[PDB]
Design a protein around this ligand. Structure first.
Ligand SMILES: [Zn+2]
Ligand SMILES: [Zn+2]
Ligand SMILES: [Zn+2]
Length: 77
Protein backbone atom coordinates (compact mmCIF):
# COMPACT_ATOMS: atom_id res chain seq x y z
CA UNK A 1 0.00 0.00 0.00
CA UNK A 2 1.23 3.46 0.97
CA UNK A 3 4.95 4.07 1.47
CA UNK A 4 5.95 3.82 5.12
CA UNK A 5 8.44 1.85 7.20
CA UNK A 6 9.91 4.55 9.44
CA UNK A 7 12.40 2.30 11.21
CA UNK A 8 15.06 1.02 8.82
CA UNK A 9 18.86 0.90 8.89
CA UNK A 10 19.57 0.08 5.25
CA UNK A 11 19.97 1.67 1.81
CA UNK A 12 19.86 0.78 -1.88
CA UNK A 13 21.84 1.91 -4.93
CA UNK A 14 20.42 4.80 -6.95
CA UNK A 15 23.16 4.77 -9.58
CA UNK A 16 21.46 1.67 -11.00
CA UNK A 17 18.41 1.15 -8.81
CA UNK A 18 19.19 -2.38 -7.70
CA UNK A 19 19.26 -4.72 -10.69
CA UNK A 20 21.69 -6.82 -12.77
CA UNK A 21 20.67 -5.43 -16.16
CA UNK A 22 20.96 -1.89 -14.81
CA UNK A 23 24.64 -1.20 -15.50
CA UNK A 24 26.43 0.51 -12.61
CA UNK A 25 29.83 2.08 -11.95
CA UNK A 26 29.92 1.50 -8.19
CA UNK A 27 28.37 -1.96 -7.90
CA UNK A 28 30.82 -2.99 -10.61
CA UNK A 29 34.12 -1.88 -12.15
CA UNK A 30 34.31 1.92 -12.09
CA UNK A 31 37.41 2.08 -14.28
CA UNK A 32 36.28 0.47 -17.54
CA UNK A 33 32.66 0.43 -16.41
CA UNK A 34 32.05 -3.29 -16.79
CA UNK A 35 29.54 -5.42 -14.91
CA UNK A 36 30.92 -8.89 -15.64
CA UNK A 37 33.26 -11.41 -14.02
CA UNK A 38 31.87 -11.18 -10.46
CA UNK A 39 34.50 -13.69 -9.33
CA UNK A 40 37.41 -11.52 -10.47
CA UNK A 41 35.95 -8.46 -8.74
CA UNK A 42 37.69 -6.95 -5.71
CA UNK A 43 35.59 -5.21 -3.06
CA UNK A 44 36.94 -2.33 -0.98
CA UNK A 45 36.77 -2.49 2.82
CA UNK A 46 35.86 1.19 3.08
CA UNK A 47 33.71 2.50 0.23
CA UNK A 48 32.58 -0.94 -0.92
CA UNK A 49 33.49 -0.67 -4.60
CA UNK A 50 34.00 -3.52 -7.06
CA UNK A 51 37.12 -3.27 -9.22
CA UNK A 52 38.53 -5.69 -11.79
CA UNK A 53 41.99 -7.22 -11.39
CA UNK A 54 42.99 -5.88 -14.81
CA UNK A 55 41.61 -2.37 -14.32
CA UNK A 56 43.71 -1.17 -11.39
CA UNK A 57 46.54 1.38 -11.27
CA UNK A 58 48.83 -0.25 -11.36
CA UNK A 59 46.91 -3.30 -12.64
CA UNK A 60 46.90 -6.78 -11.11
CA UNK A 61 48.23 -9.91 -12.82
CA UNK A 62 45.57 -11.78 -10.85
CA UNK A 63 43.38 -11.79 -7.74
CA UNK A 64 45.11 -11.05 -4.41
CA UNK A 65 44.98 -13.25 -1.30
CA UNK A 66 46.27 -11.00 1.48
CA UNK A 67 44.49 -9.89 4.66
CA UNK A 68 42.27 -7.40 2.84
CA UNK A 69 41.99 -5.38 -0.38
CA UNK A 70 41.51 -1.61 -0.54
CA UNK A 71 40.73 0.20 -3.79
CA UNK A 72 43.35 2.65 -5.12
CA UNK A 73 40.84 5.45 -4.52
CA UNK A 74 40.92 4.88 -0.76
CA UNK A 75 44.48 3.74 -0.05
CA UNK A 76 46.26 7.00 0.78
CA UNK A 77 49.65 5.29 0.99
ZN1 LIG B 1 24.62 0.31 -8.34
ZN1 LIG C 1 37.09 -3.30 -15.49
ZN1 LIG D 1 37.58 2.28 -1.50
Amino acid sequence: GSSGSSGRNDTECDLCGGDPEKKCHSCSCRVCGGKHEPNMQLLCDECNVAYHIYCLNPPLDKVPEEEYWYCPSCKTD
